[PDB]
């Protein structure tokens with residue numbers, strides 16, 4: 001997202017900039033499967049801004065609804081933990 | 092007329108103030124606070140080990156320093172990346188850390204011959220004239236050979252106890268934990284920190300390429316000649332690759348505009364220094380102008396000198412297997428911030444020269460000005476007793492209280508007692524009889540007997556100024 005100085009561009013390989021609407025990710029990742037790995041627009045996702053401590057986060061993003069009882073909620077959470085869902089890009 | 096000149100003199104000041112406000116906003120972001128907080132909490136809060144509950148801030152023995160230097164330190168430094176070492180998977184540890192110590196020699200002081208039969212050796216307090224320069228121990232590498240301050244490319248530090256030099260016996264740690272731990276264990280096996288050591292420095296740096304902003308770290312442990320351990324720390328968020336984004340170009344343009352403005356002010360002040368009036372020091376609104384100009388000139392000089400020499404960063408970037416040397420840059424950044432804060436504070440204070448637009452502000456300014464002389468006269472008398480009390484507290488309590496340790500601390504604690512913050516329960520055990528007598532007499536005299544004089548003077552002066560102003564209006 002940002003620019004890396006050319007002096008040490010061989011050392012640092014990737015940049016994950018601070019959160020901003022103009023620098024948000026809208027691409028699939030991992031084992032692409034519907035709700036949990038596809039970007040959903042704010043208008044479709046029923047959301048709104050929040051104004052957290054650091055910045056004002058929008059209502060869009062990746063989401064996954066849980067289930068109604070403990071067992072398969074734990075199963076879904078373990079699935080989201082095995083397939084790494086929290087990379088360095090999360091904000 | 093008398094209005095066309097003041098209008099220009101006000102619009103130019105408003106433009107200068109806007110430029111300065113933009114410049115000072117551009118240099119003070121919000122990520123640096125959290126960056127420093129995470130670094131400090133990672134390095135100064137985690138305990139030495141899982142069993143011990145002592146962190147770096149609570150070091151109390153030389154053995155605890157050895158326990159800390161292998162463990163929490165190595166845990167913080169080297170992180171197993173999923174070779175290089177990213178501190179939080181975000182902050183890159185560039186180069187290698189370096190540890191060095193300063194020590195003195197035996198026979199530095201002289202034990203009296205009366206009790207020489209039991210004392211064998213002594214080590215005086217740290218001093219440049221009485222520091223060791225001879226090899227000791229197994230005598231292989233730089234950790235056991237004295238190295239001059241000029242060859243180490245260092246400088247002084249001004250620690251809590253004294254002002255240490257930049258020389259000493261240093262050792263560059265490795266790039267991976269598996270070798271740094273071995274080196275530290277080797278340094279611990281042979282006696283490297285004996286009774287003769289006086290100080291120990293640990294320093295490194297990180298980059299955090301996400302936001303182009305460095306961060307230099309220095310940890311200092313002081314060993315006084317009377318025994319004990321005194322820890323210290325310092326984290327400085329430097330920035331050395333400034334020109335990357337458009338906002339940075341905007342900030343450079345603002346700096347150039349500020350330089351033009353200060354040149355114009357110095358020209359227009361040296362113009363009127365003699366033409367309008369020679370030797371005009373009774374205004375206090377022109378003695379502030381010279382202070383503004385001098386402070387700004389010093390600030391630009393420091394800024395142009397600091398950024399002109401960044402050869403250390405380049406020479407490190409040629410080969411990144413050596414220890415970077417970023418101490419001087421951090422020191423000059425601290426000095427620049429200290430100068431800029433005072434400069435902007437005086438610039439803001441300068442605003443009072445224009446707020447006289449109606450009778451209400453004019454009479455308030457007249458009241459404030461007319462009461463300065465007698466307030467200054469009484470301030471000397473007040474401060475004489477204030478410093479007498481300070482020296483009494485320093486002499487009586489200044490050795491068993493930890494709060495009256497030095498004169499400055501006595502001044503500050505009396506100021507805090509004026510605020511009614513500091514409790515009195517820590518003085519009776521320090522001294523049973525004179526403690527509460529001191530506290531009671533000080534609060535009795537300074538709290539209302541010598542404190543309401545300022546209020547009385549201000550009230551009387553304001554009342555008589557208002558009465559005179561009302562009387563002269565009706566007389567006309």
Ligand SMILES: *[C@@H]1O[C@H](CO)[C@@H](O)[C@H](O)[C@H]1NC(C)=O
Nearest residue numbers: 001012013014015016087088
């Ligand atoms: C990020 O992008 C750069 C080039 O844009 C690429 O070299 C690098 O491998 C990428 N990293 C990841 C984790 O996708």
Ligand SMILES: *[C@@H]1O[C@H](CO)[C@@H](O)[C@H](O)[C@H]1NC(C)=O
Nearest residue numbers: 030031032033034079082083
């Ligand atoms: C993604 O969905 C497909 C479709 O059934 C499924 O076979 C696959 O197991 C899913 N991915 C994961 C990681 O479960």
Ligand SMILES: *[C@@H]1O[C@H](CO)[C@@H](O)[C@H](O)[C@H]1NC(C)=O
Nearest residue numbers: 040042043044045046047065
């Ligand atoms: C979200 O809002 C839409 C209206 O566009 C509505 O149809 C839907 O029921 C709401 N909840 C869902 C299905 O996400």
Ligand SMILES: *[C@@H]1O[C@H](CO)[C@@H](O)[C@H](O)[C@H]1NC(C)=O
Nearest residue numbers: 196197198199210211212213
């Ligand atoms: C330093 O010199 C004194 C004087 O002889 C001696 O007693 C002492 O053992 C010496 N210290 C060491 C560490 O050898």
Ligand SMILES: *[C@@H]1O[C@H](CO)[C@@H](O)[C@H](O)[C@H]1NC(C)=O
Nearest residue numbers: 228229230231232277280281
């Ligand atoms: C010092 O040098 C000797 C000679 O090479 C070596 O055997 C030894 O391991 C080194 N270190 C110490 C602590 O003696």
Ligand SMILES: *[C@@H]1O[C@H](CO)[C@@H](O)[C@H](O)[C@H]1NC(C)=O
Nearest residue numbers: 241242243244406413414416
């Ligand atoms: C000190 O001198 C120069 C710094 O300009 C550098 O080339 C040299 O390697 C430095 N020495 C050490 C031990 O850092």
